[PDB]
Design an enzyme around this catalytic site. Structure first.
Site, mmCIF file in Angstrom:
data_model
loop_
_atom_site.group_PDB
_atom_site.id
_atom_site.type_symbol
_atom_site.label_atom_id
_atom_site.label_comp_id
_atom_site.label_asym_id
_atom_site.label_seq_id
_atom_site.Cartn_x
_atom_site.Cartn_y
_atom_site.Cartn_z
ATOM 1 C CG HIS A 1 -0.735 0.192 2.475
ATOM 2 N ND1 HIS A 1 -0.689 -0.822 3.405
ATOM 3 C CD2 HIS A 1 -0.456 1.328 3.142
ATOM 4 C CE1 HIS A 1 -0.360 -0.327 4.576
ATOM 5 N NE2 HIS A 1 -0.215 0.988 4.442
ATOM 6 C CB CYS B 1 1.837 0.530 7.492
ATOM 7 S SG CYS B 1 0.080 0.438 7.930
ATOM 8 N N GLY C 1 1.430 6.107 9.548
ATOM 9 C CA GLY C 1 2.891 5.992 9.373
ATOM 10 C C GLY C 1 3.514 4.753 10.029
HETATM 11 C C1 LIG Z 1 -0.339 2.027 7.660
HETATM 12 O O1 LIG Z 1 0.504 3.129 7.945
HETATM 13 C C2 LIG Z 1 -1.787 2.400 8.150
HETATM 14 C C3 LIG Z 1 -2.005 2.067 9.683
HETATM 15 C C4 LIG Z 1 -3.384 2.484 10.264
HETATM 16 C C5 LIG Z 1 -3.602 4.004 10.416
HETATM 17 C C6 LIG Z 1 -4.392 4.180 11.729
HETATM 18 N N1 LIG Z 1 -4.110 2.948 12.478
HETATM 19 C C7 LIG Z 1 -3.554 1.963 11.717
HETATM 20 O O2 LIG Z 1 -3.266 0.866 12.120
HETATM 21 N N2 LIG Z 1 -2.725 1.636 7.385
HETATM 22 C C8 LIG Z 1 -3.750 2.146 6.675
HETATM 23 O O3 LIG Z 1 -3.960 3.334 6.690
HETATM 24 C C9 LIG Z 1 -4.694 1.236 5.850
HETATM 25 C C10 LIG Z 1 -4.300 1.399 4.345
HETATM 26 C C11 LIG Z 1 -5.066 0.470 3.350
HETATM 27 C C12 LIG Z 1 -4.527 0.546 1.862
HETATM 28 C C13 LIG Z 1 -5.064 -0.948 3.810
HETATM 29 N N3 LIG Z 1 -6.014 1.654 6.039
HETATM 30 C C14 LIG Z 1 -6.630 1.566 7.277
HETATM 31 O O4 LIG Z 1 -6.086 0.994 8.212
HETATM 32 O O5 LIG Z 1 -7.921 2.146 7.451
HETATM 33 C C15 LIG Z 1 -8.411 2.526 8.810
HETATM 34 C C16 LIG Z 1 -7.839 3.903 9.524
HETATM 35 C C17 LIG Z 1 -7.027 4.915 8.836
HETATM 36 C C18 LIG Z 1 -6.558 6.110 9.504
HETATM 37 C C19 LIG Z 1 -6.903 6.364 10.866
HETATM 38 C C20 LIG Z 1 -7.700 5.406 11.550
HETATM 39 C C21 LIG Z 1 -8.147 4.209 10.892
#
Ligand SMILES: *[C@H](O)[C@H](C[C@@H]1CCNC1=O)NC(=O)[C@H](CC(C)C)NC(=O)OCc1ccccc1
Ligand SMILES: *[C@H](O)[C@H](C[C@@H]1CCNC1=O)NC(=O)[C@H](CC(C)C)NC(=O)OCc1ccccc1
Lengths: 306, 306
Positions: B41, B145, B143
């Protein structure tokens, strides 16, 4: 989101741990520059532990009686001295892995990471708080003494704790890196009393703010209170009196959440008087007090280190 | 004595964390030998997250579009490929800090340490369990991930987890280091259901043995039970069915404490049916299930690492 008891990354401290042996006693030392710090009880025999005369015991010891081992390599000891309850063993080699560091004496309610070690090797890392009775609730076995507690600010390691002993209550006592015990504790095998273990009120409040930030809000009630009215309820539940300094320290979390500190106090009062009715806050069934306001901002805003 | 949620020492993993940037998206990568592993991603824009076609997106990407930074030094990317949900970026420099390591796919109920990172820098370390619904209860912000979960056996790092996403419930999902998700989760921004979160019964039992070892014995009762009789009570409380393998795994703790596994099951049954009556076990007001039998022996016997 989510909230965990998070330790600092341990790598900078891992590179400072050595093994110190004097006769049959082996424990851990901290190697910073050309000095190894360790508990002075390393010089004690099983006999000596009840009532050691540390001055008389040390006189029978020369440099060559202190075996100092970094991994499988022996360091040469060229000097030794006692500072309060720690020994400083001067070695002929500066630790090439010495990080930027400070020795700090911390205040009750403040938190730190412990790298539990045996025979100069890391076993594990966990977060602790210095309690109001100057004990910590750690995990320590025989051979763990010389294990240290620390904080990291960016690239600087602030050493605040060295492990020396366990009390009857199963809690733990030790020194700053100048060898001064936190609390009234002495390094001899005698029944020693930890006093009243008061809850770190400002830290409970911090953690209720962490909960609100992470979407756990059931406990937010309709009431407010005053410092004096809240503290009458605190005294009854052995909570530390809340002061305006504490209110000031909670200012950023209050401002972030739009929940006034005394409104959060009112919520805390009902939790103390009503219990949690079988519910949880951030996966916990009691009120957590080993997160500082700083720990909450650090965790909820992703502060990193060198 | 004492019992804490203890993470592995993180130093060996700290030396493997880099920053990976593709356009405006920055996350963490794992640098082992001449390969950097990261979530695929990283190639997505804010637009792409709802329904990414990862094959089509990646085709618009060349080696030079992946900015890989170790501290303040840039690595040269000489190859890139997608394996399931991770990218492997081949670099021209072998990580000089590569430890001995394995990629393992772990089983539900097993535990690991997470080094939470932002921009390739460590923030903190904590212990997690892979739950029966293939989620973890972590602490992760934007950030984070590419942050990894691991175990250490002596000098060998076993990588089991890479962080990719957070579900509606505030729990966390990710992959093994071959890029295969734990559970039915996919790497797109759509409401995804974690199913029933069953308690890891064998781990609760392990933790009751830890309590007995540390002198907390109030909950030891006068009854015994059978696997089938215990499991009828487990199903009602969403506990994982106990099996003879679990009994065998608890054999060393049973033998150490002289408390037969089914007698501990009987104690667990009364705790589930009666609650804890405002008491604690090892400072906890609920039944902890993120300690394996191995974690308990490890902690209660002081197992160390390179
Ligand atoms: C990777 O950096 C990120 C980690 C998320 C951000 C908030 N808490 C986490 O564990 N992953 C993502 O943003 C992911 C991306 C997709 C292409 C899989 N999407 C996601 O986790 O959606 C839920 C979310 C995003 C932002 C804040 C709270 C929940
Ligand atoms: C230092 O290695 C050691 C740590 C103790 C051992 C058990 N848990 C700990 O935290 N410290 C001592 O053994 C200390 C030595 C005196 C000269 C201060 N004595 C002590 O802590 O007594 C209590 C105790 C000893 C052994 C097992 C359980 C409790």
């Amino acid at each position: 989101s989510g909230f965990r008891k998070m330790a600092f990354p341990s790598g900078k401290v891992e590179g400072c741990m050595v093994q110190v042996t004097c006769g049959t006693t082996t424990l851990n030392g901290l190697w910073l520059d050309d000095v190894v710090y360790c508990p002075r009880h390393v010089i004690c025999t099983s006999e000596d532990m009840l009532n050691p005369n540390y001055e008389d015991l040390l006189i029978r010891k020369s440099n060559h009686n202190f075996l100092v081992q970094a991994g499988n390599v022996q360091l040469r000891v060229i000097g030794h001295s006692m500072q309060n309850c720690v020994l400083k063993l001067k070695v002929d080699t500066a630790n090439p892995k010495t990080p930027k560091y400070k020795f700090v004496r911390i205040q009750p309610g403040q938190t730190f990471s412990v790298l539990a070690c045996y025979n100069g090797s890391p076993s594990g890392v966990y977060q602790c708080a210095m309690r109001h009775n100057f004990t910590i609730k750690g995990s320590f076995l025989n051979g763990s003494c010389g294990s240290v507690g620390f904080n990291i600010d960016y690239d600087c390691v602030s050493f605040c704790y060295m492990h020396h002993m366990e009390l009857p209550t199963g809690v733990h006592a030790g020194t700053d890196l100048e060898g001064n015990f936190y609390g009234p504790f002495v390094d001899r095998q005698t029944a020693q009393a930890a006093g009243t273990d008061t809850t770190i009120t400002v830290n409970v409040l911090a953690w209720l703010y962490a909960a609100v930030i992470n979407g756990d809000r059931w406990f937010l009630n309709r009431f407010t209170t005053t410092l004096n009215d809240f503290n009458l309820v605190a005294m009854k539940y052995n909570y530390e009196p809340l002061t305006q300094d504490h209110v000031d320290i909670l200012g950023p979390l209050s401002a972030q959440t739009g929940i006034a500190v005394l409104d959060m106090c009112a919520s805390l009062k009902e939790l103390l008087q009503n219990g949690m009715n079988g519910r949880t806050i951030l996966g916990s069934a009691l009120l957590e007090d080993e997160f500082t306001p700083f720990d909450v901002v650090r965790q909820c805003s992703g502060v990193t280190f060198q």
